[PDB]
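dumping the sequnces here before i forget
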Amino acid sequence: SNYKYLEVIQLEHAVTKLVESYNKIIELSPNLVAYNEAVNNQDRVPVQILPSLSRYQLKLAAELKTLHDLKKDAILTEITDYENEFDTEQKQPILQEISKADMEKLEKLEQVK
Amino acid sequence: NYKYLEVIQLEHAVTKLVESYNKIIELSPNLVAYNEAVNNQDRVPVQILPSLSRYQLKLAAELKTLHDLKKDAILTEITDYENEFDTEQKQPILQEISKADMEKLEKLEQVKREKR
Amino acid sequence: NYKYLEVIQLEHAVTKLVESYNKIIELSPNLVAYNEAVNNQDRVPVQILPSLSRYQLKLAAELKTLHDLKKDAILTEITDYENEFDTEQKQPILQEISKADMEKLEKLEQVKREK
Amino acid sequence: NYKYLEVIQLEHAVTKLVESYNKIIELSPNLVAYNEAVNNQDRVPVQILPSLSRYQLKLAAELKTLHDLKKDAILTEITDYENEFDTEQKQPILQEISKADMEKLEKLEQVKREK
Amino acid sequence: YDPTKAGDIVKATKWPPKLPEIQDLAIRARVFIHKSTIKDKVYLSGSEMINAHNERLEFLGDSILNSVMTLIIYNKFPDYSEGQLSTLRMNLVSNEQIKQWSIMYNFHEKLKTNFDLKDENSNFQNGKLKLYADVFEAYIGGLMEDDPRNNLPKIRKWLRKLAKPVIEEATRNQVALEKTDKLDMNAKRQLYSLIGYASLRLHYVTVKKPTAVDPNSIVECRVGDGTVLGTGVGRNIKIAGIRAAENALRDKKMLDFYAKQRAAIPRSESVLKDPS
Amino acid sequence: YDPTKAGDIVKATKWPPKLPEIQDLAIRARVFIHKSTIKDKVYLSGSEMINAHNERLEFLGDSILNSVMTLIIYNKFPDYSEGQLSTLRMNLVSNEQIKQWSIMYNFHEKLKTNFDLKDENSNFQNGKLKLYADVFEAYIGGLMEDDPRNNLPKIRKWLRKLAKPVIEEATRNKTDKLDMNAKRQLYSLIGYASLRLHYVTVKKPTAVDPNSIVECRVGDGTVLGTGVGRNIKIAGIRAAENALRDKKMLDFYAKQRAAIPRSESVLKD
RNA sequence: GCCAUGUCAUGUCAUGAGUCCAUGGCAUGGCAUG
RNA sequence: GCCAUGUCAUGUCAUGAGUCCAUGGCAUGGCAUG
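..and the predicted 3d for all of it:
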């Protein structure tokens, strides 16, 4: 079989966290302008925050929030609303990056199998 | 500006964000295996049935699919972000952020700060 | 030349030497009190009588006298010697030893090496 | 005047005083061997090295030197004093003290009996 | 070198590293004078005694020894913890190690004492023989007092050479010094999420505790009925448990079994430790 | 020049000596970050934890601290023994002392931790509060890690200033010196086997009373001297010097010895 | 393991001028306080 | 007094997805080996 219970529960969990996490970031994070201003003046940053600047997580957050403010989100934005456009009776992709062309290309790669 | 307790939540949120996408691409099939499973349910184990009713499995499958098509774009950059991070590269590691996109933003908080 | 075991003996001996002279000048009377004591022995404590029969007491008095007459010379030097010693002073602390005295001697041992 | 406790200390002091000078003249080289030792020290055994920072060896060598140069004066009779001692000679056996000097000191103490 | 296993065998050896040299003979000598040689000389003042034997130098040396080793391993292992740094440092400054270094230079044969060093019935032989270690430290002390400016670097380079083999042996073969970097600190948690519920009584057991002879541990991961889902071995119970967890996480048929088992059990009974 | 009871009463103090500065802010921040703040962050790798809080810096600094003090006193007291040196050093690097230097700079108030430092009912308060010592050591390590070349001399100067009063206070808390030969001297003067001339320890030093009393006695119990000191050896020496000073007494026992047949004299009976 | 101060035992080497005595150094170990 | 590794108890703060559960951080102390 394809799907195993153990695989399913981890997937549901991962998708749930995935969405919850991107949301928290967009909620909490400033864009790169505030980030850059902080890193070029570190003497005015509170000390417990200084190590955060040596690590990747904050910049990535700022960069993501940036893409958001610039409306280049798209794949990530669709994800946050995906649950709400999900319907058991619509059988084809809710992501518009998957067009009807890509779909059959794949069906016959596992149909060759 | 940046606050300590918010920073902790941010750093942690980002870590889960990445870990979660990695797990999805790792465990999940693409949309063809999803469609086959959702269309023959007497042949799948009884316990997975409620999950097939929900969005998570399909969304994971769609993402796994984009991965197989090499239409990932941004999501691959994110999973690669950590090992490409360097403190002395002060410019965006995401290439969708153009050096052009940056100033509408440098200036909107430039005008935003002066009504202040 | 110099041997470890001999050096310890010299150092020790030099120490006893100085400390001994010091003791003598401290404790001993000069030759006048000495002569007075030896010439009336019925009035001196009975236990010291043999000491009066020996030389030390007389020598001690003679040295003490020399001290009072400030004819010590060398002995005064010996007691001050340590207090005058400097490792970075490379020439003799004795004033009877002159750079006019130390010819005869260093050139005598330039004589002795070649035989 | 003289007390027993001072006497036993005096005999012991005098005895060692001469005994110490004897050991020195016997064991110590003269001042040139000292100078050679201090002016190298690389062929000088390590255990003897701390001895060169201290006064005893230099003074020991300087005295041995005065001996080889016969300027000993006062100290040779000191070593000779014991055999020159006789109880019935009431006169100082050291010739650095002449009986002109005694006069000064004898009348000095009738002076302090007048105090 | 050109390893002596290769065709030039009889070539002079690179070992031990060239000893830095003390130019002042006063000091070079003092290094080798033990106090048994001195404190018995009745004609010496206490001050003269202290300036004669090597104990002031041993004192100075022990510090520089300890300082330089500290910097050396600090810089060479940027990601070591303080406990790791401290444990590694113990290997470099120990009595045994310094003693061994001392013999390397035959300092023990040059040391002046008042008693028999070679006597094998002497009670000196059944001790720690710390004098040998002392003289090596005293040598370092001698070096500093001689020319503190020029000799501190030479001490640095000299000791780095001495330390390299000792470090290299210890990082590879010491258990406390091993790397914790591929451990998932969230493993026991991950496992409980997947198969865990209160009445399963999923617990970790220590089957072997670390001892002086055997500094390792074995922890079994078990359910209530005794079934072992994993085993792990590591420096302490924490690490061993983590590897036991990781062991269980790799067995996917088993995990799937227990996840389904959970799904079939009603929340409580499920949420109680003893459904009685 | 501050008598502080004259004209200097409310005037600003030149104390503490000006702190050398860590120019790398990355490092300056880190000295003050305690581990309770770091190790609970589950999204950090162990490596990232170690490079975050101050434990590496405390370690390095503790070594430099001990190093610099050790040279300082080695040079300032050329005639000190190793025990004297070692004992003196203990005052300089001790927990209580480093803790004090730390508070002097308010490091205790700047230290970022995860729990309540001011809670007086907290169990952190009846322990050693070694953390306060640690943060001070960490400052030294930070200065060293930042610029080891330029900052080691500045640290020397600085620590020498901090150390000076503590030393001056320890060294005070000279006179005639002990004759290590006194007991010998006395036996020479009055001693013989049957006098059973011996020393008695009346008081052994204790933590409460770090002193000792030794009496010098003859066989019949008579005390010829008393001496008081840091240990039994010093006390005994001081008893002897006491006995050596009573010349009427010495003369008495010397005369006594002289009177005894050496047949009996040389026996303990 | 390691450190200081204090105290005690055993082995050993010295020192002292009445020694069948007296005083210390070192080495190895013990105990107490820190 | 103090150090490392190991192991345990009390208090406290976190983490986790089945939580009346599970796993850790810190602080204070106990015991073992070196």
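The two ends of chain F are 68 Å apart (CA to CA).
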